[PDB]
Write a protein that binds this ligand. Structure first.
Ligand SMILES: CN1CCn2c(Cc3ccccc3)nc(=O)c(O)c2C1=O
Ligand SMILES: [Mg+2]
Ligand SMILES: [Mg+2]
Length: 308
């Protein structure tokens, strides 16, 4: 995510954020960041919470006429050609910050979406008749591309860096309370920045891909981006003794990653929603995952009715 982005937009561009009832979305298609959704199900208060949340939160969407397409993460982006970055390195950064102390905040970040979580959620979605795509890299980047192409109305994720990846519309809290909807065009207009400049502001705010300048906070960053437009222009004017830039700063590699990310082909995708398979759903959820037969049978019934 982008450190303090949702709070900064609430201060500078409040009219880009709108809170709406889930009843206002009947008939809409959304691209859900499945990796972040599974993560959110695992951290809420062996485990089957990933399947429980996937089954009941998807049935709720279908009961409110929302048609979801789940997008799963592929390989992590590589910023340098010499090194091999792994998503577990971010969880290692979260473990250092945890033992220092916001204690609960860093405890959530340790949680891994395992191989078994992804495969069992894709198995559940197939039985339910819900389509899913595998993104070549970040699912939030592919959710944004599906929106730009007009394939779906919005990207549904808790990840603010979906705006950084260019998603025109971002819906938050769909798998949780009203839906929080962000409009990128309105954000860019109120800040007086184009997408390239917004990506550099997000870098200075704090992203998962590189460091941000120590000493330059959120208000100072907006100002410096409004005046100088780029990070290369800001660094060439900062006092190197007052504000030293990070050593071996990957800000250029992070910028390219956000502007031209590796995304799925939206035209290769032919979205279909099909009838749930009740017999195979009971055998998997109850027979294999020890779920209550009556609670599953009831959910499948609500889901079948939602289509017809
Ligand atoms: C599958 N997950 C796991 C959680 N997650 C987070 C949350 C986080 C932040 C920093 C280190 C670890 C996890 N931020 C993202 O930016 C992000 O993309 C994800 C994600 O997709
Ligand atoms: Mg992210
Ligand atoms: Mg993600």
């Amino acid at each position: 995510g982008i450190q303090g982005l949702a709070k900064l937009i609430a201060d500078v561009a409040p009219s880009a954020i709108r809170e709406n009832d889930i009843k206002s979305y009947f008939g809409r298609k959304v691209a859900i960041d499945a990796s972040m959704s599974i993560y959110q199900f695992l951290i809420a208060v062996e485990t089957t919470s990933h399947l429980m949340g996937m089954f009941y939160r998807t049935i709720r969407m279908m009961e409110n006429g929302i048609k979801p397409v789940y997008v799963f993460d592929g390989k992590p982006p590589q910023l340098k050609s010499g090194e091999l970055a792994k998503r577990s390195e971010r969880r290692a950064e979260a473990e250092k910050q945890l033992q220092q102390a916001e204690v609960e905040k860093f405890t959530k970040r340790l949680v891994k979406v395992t191989k078994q979580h992804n495969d069992e959620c894709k198995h559940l979605l197939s039985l339910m008749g819900i389509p899913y795509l595998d993104a070549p890299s970040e699912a939030e980047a592919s959710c944004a591309a599906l929106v730009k192409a007009g394939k779906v109305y919005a990207a549904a994720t808790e990840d603010m860096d979906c705006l950084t990846f260019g998603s025109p519309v971002l819906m938050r809290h769909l798998t949780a309370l009203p839906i929080q909807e962000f409009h990128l065009s309105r954000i860019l207009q109120e800040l007086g920045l184009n997408q390239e400049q917004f990506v550099d502001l997000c870098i200075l705010l704090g992203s998962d891909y590189c460091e941000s300048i120590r000493g330059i906070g959120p208000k100072r960053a907006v100002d410096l981006i409004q005046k100088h437009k780029s990070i290369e222009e800001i660094v060439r004017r900062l006092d190197p003794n007052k504000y030293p830039v990070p050593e071996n700063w990957l800000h250029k590699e992070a910028h390219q990653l956000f502007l031209e990310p590796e995304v799925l082909d939206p035209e290769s995708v032919e979205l279909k929603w099909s009838e749930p398979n009740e017999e195979e759903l009971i055998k998997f959820m109850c027979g294999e995952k020890q779920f209550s037969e009556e609670r599953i049978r009831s959910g499948v019934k609500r889901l079948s009715k939602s289509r017809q």
